[PDB]
Design a binder for this molecule. Structure first.
Ligand SMILES: Cc1cc2nc3c(=O)[nH]c(=O)nc-3n(C[C@H](O)[C@H](O)[C@H](O)COP(=O)(O)OP(=O)(O)OC[C@H]3O[C@@H](n4cnc5c(N)ncnc54)[C@H](O)[C@@H]3O)c2cc1C
Ligand SMILES: CCCCCCCC/C=C\CCCCCCCC(=O)OC[C@H](COP(=O)(O)OCCN)OC(=O)CCCCCCC/C=C\CCCCCCCC
Ligand code: SF4
Ligand code: F3S
Ligand code: FES
Lengths: 238, 144, 593, 134
């Protein structure tokens, strides 16, 4: 009854127990009828019913942990939100995140990214709390300023699409870490900002941005890490 | 002491594998978008027109100390006899648009460092007006 | 063949979730050499997906008193919870939320300048006889995501040696007491052998044993099985909670704020479920009576659907600016998995497996338990503690109250950090142990790696998932439960004929996902066995052939033993505590209806 | 960049473990925040003064052309300078980041003298670029 339609996925491959080989692209034919409407539902059917040497990261299938972010069909996006077009005449190319030292197949080494998130000090730095032991006070129009900043999931689909982070990624902090350096500047209860605005005032940590905004274009959660850099620059001068 | 020999015995078996990993490709797979195709024509357009501003002034500088006596009407009539007739226009037609995509590109950038129009709807509507401004100013400079 | 690398710490923590992180900087804020072993990066866990609120009797929207919050927790468990842990978790709840704002959690504010509290389901004030209460203390739709990213930034303030992407294999036991773990460095391919004094298990729940769950992909029971492979019991495994609102087909979750502020469970004929087939008087009750309300409605035939195993829920009566300010994250998870927006048409709904109210049996101060096999009293395991979802303090008992499991992590993670500081001294040498310590797990990692049989490791997982959805379900009797015990022993016996096609050692994602099947068969065989030996119906365990609650013969927890896969299961019982910590601060409630 | 020598780099891109923080360079606001001011000054000047270089019929006055010819030098200096620290950096080339910053010294200090022979002897730089054509 159900005549099978066949799309052809083209997945990047490497195997670090034979590093003399070159990374290549391998073709898998997936029966599109008994498969889910997303790409992670198609990359898990390959691992179950075909070659299970394929490795990748996945945790929730909803889009909130940021663990299966790859380069699907040309742009950086999350593989459990990206939708297969039901048109079985064209192919699909799945790559890892661009310009990262990859580990096995589609897993990049995000170790330099976790040492740069540690260094903007992501914790509150007050010095005094109210006398009857209750919470600190904050009005609604100061709480409105954080909307669009605290809800980043740390996927690095913005950092690894920025040509300045493709070359100087060992000293430039990237658009993902420079937005979270700004979530702690404009918090109304964070009374030490003379030090937060002093580790960014060197030659290349904030000023290797040229406003070529691939970041705001490719964030899958719909945030704006390109506007949130251009308020730090407007504050470090003024 | 343990835990100090554990961060040395593990690093030497980690740095032996870590130095054989490849680099995933970055250009030649990324998607042609408007955001890095317009701000890679703004970095080019000041290198080419910037070399033509340096090179036409050291020639008036190294002939300032060293006595050569180069005048404006001397180096201008030297230019016209040199290149062919279709070449005198092709440099003239390339450098016409390279000025207009940078003169229209310096106006655009100065809005962006006051944090205005930095949404995703504003980057595209002040990026289509950059394509209109090039084709009506750079064409006007060819008639003159 | 294998590289064995030794370490030497004071308190190692397994798991870096919401409950392993809170007990890993309360430990490093006292002078201890803490270490946190995790399989994922600490902000990729399952408590990043929580979206409700944290119950606390702050009372900044009306009058409130925590003595009433104690009554709704014990009534909501149908009197199987330990009533001295309810006294502790509810007393220290205003302190452990105001403390959570001094760490910098962006709590939703009110016009006064204080923390905003919505109205959740199950809590009413004045001792169960009064109006509905407003205690949930919420960020908008991302309370779980803003609780991880603050506790992880706070555990960067102190020194805490994170060992990210290590897979813990087994507990190192010796002469009846534990001394540490043995992990597996997933990035590199070496075997690490940590040694500690008070190892703390905060792994998480098993949810992937069923076919359609709302858990993550990494929520295999990995800390319930490590304990039971050493000989220790697991407590109350048959009580599994079924959430009444999960999307058809995939199993994704919509919140209970979709019915906490305005929500109509809408049938095929178009009415609200208030009476006359399935429902009680007050709506939006505890999830036990509202999920069994649904599965009988679609059984009779009053359920909208193409195959008519399907339901509706509208979100159109609300104003569209309160569907934006208070519930924005649900609006995207209903438009991409269902393809229907939440402002004009209803959305598909089915009940799926949500939370597991069982695990390692625990005191109220974090220490694990067992029984002495002669007198049957309690007896602490020397050197092992547990906290989180993988620990059964029985503060939830038989039915977990809604939005009460994020208070479980902050309060009982703070308590685990304090009771080590009163007992263990900082700085103490370790006893010397033999050289092949942990040799049974290297022989078991090696066996699953060089496997060659007939059945693939993704086919045995489909026989287990289709069995426990069919038999061990919301409506169960002792003629289909017995069919489940015979089937889940058959799927267990064919694990010695598995097939693995990846002999590599650096990021083996076929050796990890076949160890997550060994862990999920030990957890799943004692769920169908421990439910075929409970002839009563309370909470989320309902029997078709014994429809009344027996308070005199079944007021007891259940303990279960199973050493390996395909081994016989034995069961024994212990008495549930029924007295508080202070008879003058609060009096214990009597068992009523 | 061919014909240059390269410093020995880090094996794989990183050294250590994810709890080893990245220690930032000290505050050097003559290369940081002040350099952002000497980039907007030369951009807010060559935009209006080039608009009064098409709306003029003859040449410009020597006063209104000498102020336009220094600002075009500082504009093109601050874009060749950031193409040095972006591509010929100092982790991967070492001392040749500082030598190629000296070729923007005495290869641009003799361009300032070359303007002085175009403002007094001849007429300006907009008089030169119109004289050729276009
Ligand atoms: C969909 C969903 C919605 C929920 N919504 C709410 C809500 O609104 N309100 C509420 O109060 N509660 C809610 N809960 C319940 C609660 O959020 C979670 O059950 C609870 O947070 C789990 O936290 P935990 O610390 O127990 O475990 P987790 O947070 O799951 O900790 C798991 C971590 O343990 C580590 N780990 C696991 N296995 C291993 C291993 N083998 N080796 C090493 N490390 C390992 C990993 O780091 C992993 O990240 C929800 C649960 C779910 C599933
Ligand atoms: C020497 C190197 C030159 C490279 C740059 C090419 C400049 C193209 C301009 C062509 C041109 O000169 O057209 C003449 C036109 C006016 O002609 P009229 O006959 O007077 O008619 C007046 C009618 N009301 O003048 C102009 O268009 C431009 C004026 C001269 C500017 C040239 C100096 C800039 C050179 C290099 C710096 C490049 C930086 C980018 C632009 C600066 C920022 C906007
Ligand atoms: S800004 Fe967006 S793309 Fe970048 S890490 Fe955060 S969620 Fe991901
Ligand atoms: S793409 Fe890069 S240059 Fe800035 S605007 Fe975004 S961080
Ligand atoms: S699995 Fe959580 S983002 Fe795709």
């Amino acid at each position: 009854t159900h005549t099978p339609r066949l799309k052809t996925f083209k997945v990047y491959r490497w195997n670090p127990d034979e590093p003399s080989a070159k990374p290549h692209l391998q073709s898998y034919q997936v029966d599109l009828n008994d498969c889910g409407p997303m790409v992670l539902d198609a990359l898990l059917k390959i691992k179950d019913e075909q070659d299970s040497t394929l490795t990748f990261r996945r945790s929730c299938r909803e889009g909130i942990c940021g663990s299966c972010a790859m380069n699907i069909g040309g742009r950086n996006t999350l593989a459990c939100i990206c939708k297969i077009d039901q048109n079985e005449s064209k192919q699909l190319k799945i790559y890892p995140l661009p310009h990262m030292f990859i580990v096995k197949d589609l897993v990049p080494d995000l170790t330099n990214f976790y040492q740069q998130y540690k260094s903007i000090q992501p914790y509150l730095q007050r010095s005094s709390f109210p006398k009857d032991g209750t919470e600190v006070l904050q009005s609604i129009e100061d709480r409105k300023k954080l909307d669009g900043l605290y809800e980043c999931i740390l996927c690095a689909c913005c950092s690894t699409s920025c040509p300045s982070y493709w070359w100087n990624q060992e000293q430039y902090l990237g658009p993902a870490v420079l937005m979270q350096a700004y979530r702690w500047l404009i918090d109304s209860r964070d009374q030490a900002t003379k030090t937060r605005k002093a580790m960014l005032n060197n030659s290349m940590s904030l000023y290797r941005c040229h406003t070529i905004m691939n970041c705001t274009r490719t964030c899958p959660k719909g945030l704006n890490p390109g506007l949130a850099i251009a308020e730090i620059k407007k504050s470090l001068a003024f | 002491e343990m835990n100090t020999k554990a961060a040395i015995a593990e690093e030497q078996i980690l740095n032996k594998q870590r130095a054989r990993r490849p680099i995933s490709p970055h250009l030649t797979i990324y998607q042609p978008q408007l955001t890095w195709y317009l701000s890679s024509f703004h970095r080019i357009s000041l290198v080419l027109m910037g070399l033509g501003f340096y090179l036409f002034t050291i020639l008036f500088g190294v002939s300032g100390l060293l006595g050569l006596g180069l005048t404006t009407e001397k180096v201008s009539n030297w230019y016209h006899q040199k290149f062919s007739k279709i070449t005198e226009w092709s440099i003239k037609g390339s450098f016409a648009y390279l000025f207009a995509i940078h003169y229209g590109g310096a106006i655009r950038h100065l809005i962006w460092d006051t944090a205005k129009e930095l949404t995703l709807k504003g980057v595209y509507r002040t990026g289509y007006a950059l394509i209109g401004f090039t084709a009506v100013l750079g064409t006007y400079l060819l008639t003159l | 063949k294998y590289h064995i690398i030794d370490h030497e710490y004071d308190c190692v923590v397994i798991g870096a979730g919401g409950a392993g992180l809170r007990a890993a900087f309360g430990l490093a804020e006292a002078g201890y050499k803490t270490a946190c072993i995790s399989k994922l990066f600490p902000t990729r866990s399952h408590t990043v997906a929580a979206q409700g609120g944290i119950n606390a009797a702050l009372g900044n929207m009306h009058k409130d008193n925590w003595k009433w919050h104690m009554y709704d927790t014990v009534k909501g468990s149908d009197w199987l919870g330990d009533q001295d842990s309810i006294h502790y978790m509810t007393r220290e709840a205003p302190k452990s939320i105001i403390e959570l704002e001094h760490y910098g959690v962006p709590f939703s504010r009110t016009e006064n300048g204080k923390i905003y509290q919505r109205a959740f389901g199950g809590q009413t004030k004045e001792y169960g006889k009064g109006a509905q209460a407003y205690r949930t203390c919420a960020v908008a739709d991302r309370t779980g995501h803003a609780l991880l990213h603050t506790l992880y930034g706070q555990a960067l303030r102190h020194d805490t040696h994170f060992f990210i992407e290590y897979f813990a294999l087994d507990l190192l036991t010796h002469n009846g007491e534990v001394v540490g773990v043995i992990a597996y460095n997933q990035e590199d391919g070496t075997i690490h052998r940590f040694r500690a004094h008070k190892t703390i298990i905060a792994t998480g729940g098993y949810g992937r044993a069923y076919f359609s769950c709302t858990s993550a992909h990494t929520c295999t029971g990995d800390g319930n099985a490590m304990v039971s492979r050493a000989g220790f019991p697991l407590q109350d495994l048959e009580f599994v909670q079924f959430h009444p609102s999960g999307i058809y087909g995939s199993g994704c979750l919509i919140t209970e704020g979709a019915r906490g502020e305005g929500g109509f469970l809408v049938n095929s004929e178009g009415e609200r479920f208030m009476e006359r087939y399935a429902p009680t008087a007050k709506d939006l009750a505890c999830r036990d009576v509202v999920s069994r309300a649904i599965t009988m409605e679609i059984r009779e035939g009053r359920g909208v659907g193409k195959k008519k195993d399907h339901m509706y829920l509208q979100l159109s009566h609300l104003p569209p600016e309160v569907l934006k300010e208070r519930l924005p994250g649900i609006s995207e998870t209903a438009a991409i998995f269902a393809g229907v927006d939440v402002t004009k048409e209803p959305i598909p709904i089915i009940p799926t497996v949500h939370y597991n109210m069982g695990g390692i049996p625990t005191k109220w101060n974090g220490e694990a338990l067992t029984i002495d096999e002669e007198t049957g009293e309690d007896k602490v395991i020397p050197g092992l503690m547990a906290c989180g979802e993988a620990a059964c303090v029985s503060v939830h008992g038989a039915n977990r109250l809604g939005a009460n499991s994020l208070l479980d992590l902050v309060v009982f993670g703070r308590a685990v950090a304090h009771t080590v500081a009163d007992t263990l001294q900082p700085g103490l040498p370790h006893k010397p142990l033999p050289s092949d310590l942990g040799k049974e797990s290297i022989a078991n990692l090696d066996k699953l790696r060089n496997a060659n049989g007939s059945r693939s490791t993704a086919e045995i997982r489909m026989n287990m998932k289709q069995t426990m959805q069919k038999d061990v379900s919301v409506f169960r009797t002792q003629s289909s439960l017995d069919e489940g015990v015979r089937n889940i022993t058959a799927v267990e016996k064919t694990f010695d004929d598995v097939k693995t096609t990846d002999r590599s050692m650096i990021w083996n994602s076929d050796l990890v996902e076949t160890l997550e099947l060994q862990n999920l068969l030990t957890c799943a065989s004692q769920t169908a066995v421990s439910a075929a030996n409970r002839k009563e119906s309370r909470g989320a365990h309902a029997r078709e052939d014994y429809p009344n609650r027996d308070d005199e013969h079944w007021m007891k927890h259940t303990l279960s033993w199973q050493k390996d896969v395909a081994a016989p299961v034995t069961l024994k019982y212990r008495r549930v505590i029924d007295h508080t910590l202070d008879e003058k601060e609060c009096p214990s409630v009597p068992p009523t209806v | 960049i061919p014909f240059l020598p390269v410093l020995p780099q880090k094996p794989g891109g990183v050294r250590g473990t994810p709890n080893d923080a990245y220690v930032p360079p000290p505050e050097n606001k003559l290369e940081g925040s002040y350099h952002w001011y000497m980039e907007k000054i030369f951009a807010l000047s060559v935009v209006p003064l080039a608009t009064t270089a098409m709306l003029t019929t003859g040449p410009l006055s020597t006063a209104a052309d000498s102020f336009f010819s220094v600002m075009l030098l500082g504009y093109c200096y601050m874009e060749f300078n950031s193409c040095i620290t972006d591509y010929i950096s100092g982790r991967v080339y070492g001392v040749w980041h500082k030598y190629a910053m000296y070729m923007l010294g005495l290869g641009s200090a003799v361009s300032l003298f070359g303007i002085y022979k175009l403002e007094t002897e001849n007429d300006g730089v907009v008089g030169l670029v119109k004289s050729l054509w276009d």
